[PDB]
Design a binder for this molecule. Structure first.
Ligand SMILES: CC(C)CCC[C@@H](C)[C@H]1CC[C@H]2[C@@H]3CC=C4C[C@@H](O)CC[C@]4(C)[C@H]3CC[C@]12C
Ligand SMILES: CC(C)CCC[C@@H](C)[C@H]1CC[C@H]2[C@@H]3CC=C4C[C@@H](O)CC[C@]4(C)[C@H]3CC[C@]12C
Ligand SMILES: N#Cc1c(N)nc(SCc2ncc[nH]2)c(C#N)c1-c1ccccc1
Ligand SMILES: N#Cc1c(N)nc(SCc2ncc[nH]2)c(C#N)c1-c1ccccc1
Ligand SMILES: CCCCCCCC/C=C\CCCCCCCC(=O)O
Ligand SMILES: CCCCCCCC/C=C\CCCCCCCC(=O)O
Ligand SMILES: CCCCCCCC/C=C\CCCCCCCC(=O)O
Ligand SMILES: CCCCCCCC/C=C\CCCCCCCC(=O)O
Ligand SMILES: CCCCCCCC/C=C\CCCCCCCC(=O)O
Ligand SMILES: CCCCCCCC/C=C\CCCCCCCC(=O)O
Ligand code: NA
Ligand code: NA
Lengths: 381, 381
């Protein structure tokens, strides 16, 4: 049984190292968005809300975690504030991650109405609502769902606490049924599962749109071959009618549709050879115009998929960092006779959850050019 | 390719956290030995030499590691000093660990001559020799075994280095054949293997001595039973002669040997019943005296085994922390075409080796009462 200040010196130093990084990296995220007008869009306002939560993890949650780990004497409700504040930040993070996923789904599924649906001032209103909701969720124990009515009086007397005070220990004041059913299952697990569903729908929408672009491109080229190897005017007409509906479906295009109409008129006059010659002109338009549109549309979809993968990595890292702590609480709660969860593992799980506040600035720097470039310029300046 | 200052900010913060802990813990080790005269013995003078090396890891090696990781412009030999200084500390640690193992072997194998062989002033002389040898081993590259004759001129010109300067990078100035054959195989691996051999001999010596104590105890009790179930004076004499040689072998004992002689005289006179009655008196002496010696001797051996296990854990942790770095160097050296050792893994291996400077104060606190108690009193004061 080595002096408690030794093992806790490792814990405290690790916590403070994480706080330094959480503050530095996320201040840099906010700074980049403030300076670069190319980074000022709705998606990045939620990115700023998420970085603000991570800055408060370093400034407030980590000092609070170090404090409550001592078990210092405190009035139960004051204790309950420094125990639960991290839950407010985690909840705010969940709401920002969920909003980012929904923003990306609107952008890929209905890009025509994105600008009119997703407004900068509406994003600020959603963020405000989400922060107020997060306070209500994270601080629900202070509203009455707590163990303040059944204080551990033996622990309070041992530590020489005053009347009306308890030894401030997280597990003594925050109910385990709140942590597992309310915080984990309802407020963390359900939103993360919803996020997963949204990301699946984003990638499936992108996969289908790319297939539809290639399907229309193939239909155009295949029907040109059908016209070349046709012997009757009815066969030329059949392929041209299918090409015309496909050209409007994919909507340079004025020349294309006009040239299809020119050949269709010749086909209807029974001039097969003349219709096939008119259809050959379509190849020049396809090369000079249509292929450029196809390649630009494909490149736009790939950029959207790349941005959605970056956002999903951010969400995936939140799940990876927070799940161990939640899972440990599930074992403590659901298996009361399980000899499990040593204190070193509980501190490792807490340290891992705090680590999530360090990782997002790295993901933006490694995956997003505009962020990476702005970070270089801020470090230079 | 995120800005280099970001990933290196994680590395630097982790290195500085380790330096804080290496200094704090090992200052506490030195403080305890200085204050408590129960901790002032030869074994703990080597413990202080090992803690002094760990304090210099925090004060000098870690700031040097951070510095050379930038690749700053430097005169090749100056570069070679801040590259190799950590090797001096690692070598000094190896010598202290080896001395601690040899000290414990002398204590268990020849406890009668330990005080006369192992002197405090001789320990200070060995430590002095070991530190001078460590400087020669660790700084052998500065004596000429270096890549200063073949500077990477393209790297020096790129960084705008002056004439006579190189980009200070460990792998550019310290030869890989020095690191693998000389530093690893000869100066690290051979001494660690020697340490393992010494620890095996310590535990085998302890195991044999405990078996010899129980063998003499069993021989005493079994021969008492032989005397009780004897019918002739020759049988009583045979068991008493074996008991007498065993009593001197285990050397209260004056009473025991005298009572054996009393019964032996009766046996030689052909007085069987009288000899068996005289031998029954041995039981009172065995209970009042001999069993107390047996239990104290057994308890002393168990304390020595416990102390040797603690010292072996210290050595085992050095091997566990330093081996990954050495093994990575072996892959780089022996397999030049092996696409291996990413830079994040090289930093993880360096961070793990530095971590070894933090762990020893914890092992003493968790395993050694006199250290643990002194640490409490230093923290109280
Ligand atoms: C994607 C979702 C479903 C993953 C979230 C993790 C949850 C639902 C799972 C994963 C492992 C599960 C635990 C596995 C082991 C036990 C021990 C048993 O005595 C009580 C239930 C308990 C404690 C389970 C509770 C629920 C649990 C924590
Ligand atoms: C107890 C002692 C023997 C353990 C010390 C580790 C040393 C001797 C061993 C363990 C794993 C070994 C390495 C395993 C793989 C390779 C790849 C091969 O292409 C070159 C040799 C090399 C690089 C070996 C060199 C020696 C090595 C590093
Ligand atoms: N779940 C849980 C939990 C806990 N069971 N304990 C503590 S603090 C005392 C402690 N740390 C290690 C051992 N004992 C904390 C804190 N902060 C938490 C916690 C909860 C949510 C978010 C972040 C952390
Ligand atoms: N072996 C090796 C080694 C190395 N190959 N490089 C570096 S420093 C640049 C670096 N760190 C990460 C990537 N690149 C260092 C240092 N210090 C060492 C080293 C050697 C002995 C002891 C402790 C560390
Ligand atoms: C603490 C919260 C600070 C974070 C909010 C400031 C960022 C402003 C912005 O980038 O638009
Ligand atoms: C919603 C805000 C309601 C105020 C809750 C007070 C909590 C309390 O006093 O226990
Ligand atoms: C990074 C890993 C170090 C994890 C820090 C937590 C150490 C806690 C030690 C303890 O108090 O039991
Ligand atoms: C830096 C090296 C300092 C360590 C040596 C001082 C300890 C003295 C002692 O405990 O005997
Ligand atoms: C042994 C000491 C010898 C001095 C070595 C000098 C090293 C050098 O100048 O390269
Ligand atoms: C503790 C684990 C953290 C390890 C610190 C090293 C991070 C290095 C990052 C890098 O520069 O590639
Ligand atoms: Na967060
Ligand atoms: Na060391």
């Amino acid at each position: 049984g080595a002096p408690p200040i030794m093992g806790s010196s490792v814990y405290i130093t690790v916590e403070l190292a994480i706080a330094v990084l959480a503050i530095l990296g996320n201040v840099l995220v906010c700074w980049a968005v403030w300076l670069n007008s190319n980074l000022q869009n709705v998606t990045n306002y939620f990115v700023v809300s998420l970085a603000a939560a991570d800055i408060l993890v370093g400034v407030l949650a980590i000092p609070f975690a170090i404090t409550i780990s001592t078990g210092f004497c405190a009035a139960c409700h004051g204790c309950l504030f420094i125990a639960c504040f991290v839950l407010v930040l985690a909840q705010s993070s969940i709401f920002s991650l969920l909003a980012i996923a929904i923003d990306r789904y609107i952008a890929i599924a209905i890009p025509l109405r994105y600008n009119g649906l997703v407004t900068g001032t509406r994003a600020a209103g959603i963020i405000a609502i989400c922060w107020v909701l997060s306070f209500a969720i994270g601080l629900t124990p202070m509203l009455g769902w707590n163990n303040c009515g059944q204080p551990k009086e033996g622990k309070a007397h041992s530590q020489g606490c005053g009347e009306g005070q308890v030894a401030c220990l997280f597990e003594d004041v925050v109910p385990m049924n709140y942590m597992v059913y309310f915080n984990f299952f309802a407020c963390v697990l359900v939103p993360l599962l919803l996020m997963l569903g949204v990301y699946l729908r984003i990638f499936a929408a992108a996969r289908r749109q790319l297939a539809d672009l290639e399907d229309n491109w193939e239909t155009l080229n295949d029907n040109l071959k059908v016209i070349e190897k046709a012997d009757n005017a009815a066969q030329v007409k059949d392929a041209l009618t299918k090409m015309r509906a496909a050209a409007l479906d994919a909507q340079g295009f004025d020349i294309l549709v006009g040239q299809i109409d020119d050949a269709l008129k010749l086909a209807n006059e029974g001039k097969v050879k003349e219709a096939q010659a008119a259809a050959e002109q379509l190849k020049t338009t396809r090369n000079a115009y249509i292929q450029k549109y196809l390649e630009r549309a494909r490149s736009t979809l790939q950029k959207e998929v790349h941005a959605a993968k970056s956002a999903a990595i951010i969400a995936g890292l939140f799940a990876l960092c927070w799940l161990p702590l939640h899972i440990i609480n599930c074992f403590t709660f659901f298996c009361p006779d399980c000899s499990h969860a040593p204190l070193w593992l509980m501190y490792l799980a807490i340290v891992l959850a705090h680590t999530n506040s360090v990782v997002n600035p790295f993901i933006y720097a490694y995956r997003i050019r505009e962020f990476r470039q702005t970070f270089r310029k801020i470090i230079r300046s």
